[PDB]
Design a protein around this ligand. Structure first.
Ligand SMILES: CCNC(=O)c1noc(-c2cc(C(C)C)c(O)cc2O)c1-c1ccc(CN2CCOCC2)cc1
Ligand SMILES: CCNC(=O)c1noc(-c2cc(C(C)C)c(O)cc2O)c1-c1ccc(CN2CCOCC2)cc1
Lengths: 208, 208
């Protein structure tokens, strides 16, 4: 049922850095995730240009932000290309080993955490505000899976049997106790207007 | 031998905008191209993780900037994944129709040209300083081609028989008469230090 994997040593080191380094500008985590969703949404667009049947799993390309104060989660859903089990296991489709190399090296030469995404490892900025992150994903070439980690050197991957989503990725952020501002309508609007104003797909902020 | 294609109406409109709009900050064009090269270099890295034989066409991943004052060209070569003829014809691998949509719409709502790359059409910023742009490209799954355009609503694609490059892309900028500062060692250093300091691959500035 549940498979458990060790993070590579560098990712495990990146995550510990993210979690442990005092750094107040935690809000960038949302920009980095909406920017991954946009990327994943570009890819399915690009693919559907030459093969229109790639969109049979959903023709709408968009991003939804869904807070839930009862569960203490913020969830970014996109109808992008999604990831295959292989992609999930190989660091969620990213060049994360060499990306963390570059990033640590940049951190040496005068970069701050907010720059994480120029190394292609922006996803991990989720650990700025979340204590567990769950990624449900569905790519056309594969079944639906859920990747999950509370950091600590390991992640899990299982097949997901709850709500088929048809196509895309859902990043559920189980927020830290003291990071619940990110569940506020007003606070999320502010960050999307500030950091993600010019994204080429609709972003819908759901209400509770 | 030479095939000739019409730009889609929007790209042709984007290019005319780029060429015709007074906008002094022309130097961003280099950031946008080094950033495409980095992206193309990420992709071959990601692919080679699971299939190491993808690197048989070259194991070095890097970017070279090569001015030539005699020919009045600046050339950005990368050993990235390269593009197939299909990719070249379909707007150099980009979602350019909807990207230009997004960009024009952003330009409405208060964005400037320097933001072009957040819509995935940064390549065309080459027309800020170049009167012709030639792209030689080689992907593992295809032969070597040269795409070329002086704008004006059409591009050409031929197969390239000069210097096999093994794998990657070469963007040759035939610079405009009054844009030759971009051929100066000092000026290029300045722009790379300013806009592209934290790129995860070596950038080599060649000397004349
Ligand atoms: C290759 C086939 N699929 C995908 O690329 C894909 N589908 O869904 C993706 C999403 C991934 C993330 C995180 C988990 C990496 C999201 O937050 C949202 C997505 O939609 C997603 C994806 C999107 C972005 C990235 C990271 N980029 C960052 C810059 O380097 C290249 C890769 C990795 C994966
Ligand atoms: C899909 C298989 N190949 C590639 O993606 C590829 N190989 O070489 C690429 C380069 C492209 C450009 C311009 C011509 C688009 C470069 O300037 C440099 C490259 O190395 C290149 C490429 C790199 C970037 C882009 C544009 N990005 C921009 C953001 O949206 C997604 C696509 C398009 C193509």
């Amino acid at each position: 049922e549940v498979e458990t994997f060790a993070f590579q040593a560098e990712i495990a080191q990146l995550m510990s850095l993210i979690i442990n380094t005092f750094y107040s500008n935690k809000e960038i985590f949302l920009r980095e995730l909406i920017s991954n969703s946009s990327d994943a949404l570009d890819k399915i667009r690009y693919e559907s240009l030459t093969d229109p049947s790639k969109l049979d799993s959903g023709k709408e390309l968009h991003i939804n932000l869904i807070p839930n104060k009862q569960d203490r989660t913020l969830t970014i859903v996109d109808t992008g290309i999604g990831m295959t089990k292989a992609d999930l296991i190989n660091n969620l489709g990213t060049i994360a080993k060499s990306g963390t190399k570059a990033f640590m090296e940049a951190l040496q030469a005068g970069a701050d955490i907010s720059m994480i995404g120029q190394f292609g490892v922006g996803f991990y900025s989720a650990y700025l505000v979340a204590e567990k992150v769950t990624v449900i994903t569905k790519h056309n070439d594969d079944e639906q899976y859920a990747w999950e980690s509370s950091a600590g050197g390991s992640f899990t991957v299982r097949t997901d049997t709850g709500e088929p989503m048809g196509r895309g990725t859902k990043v559920i952020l189980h927020l830290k106790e003291d990071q619940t501002e990110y569940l506020e309508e007003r606070r999320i609007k502010e960050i999307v207007k500030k950091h993600s104003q010019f994204i080429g797909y609709p972003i819908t902020l759901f209400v509770e």
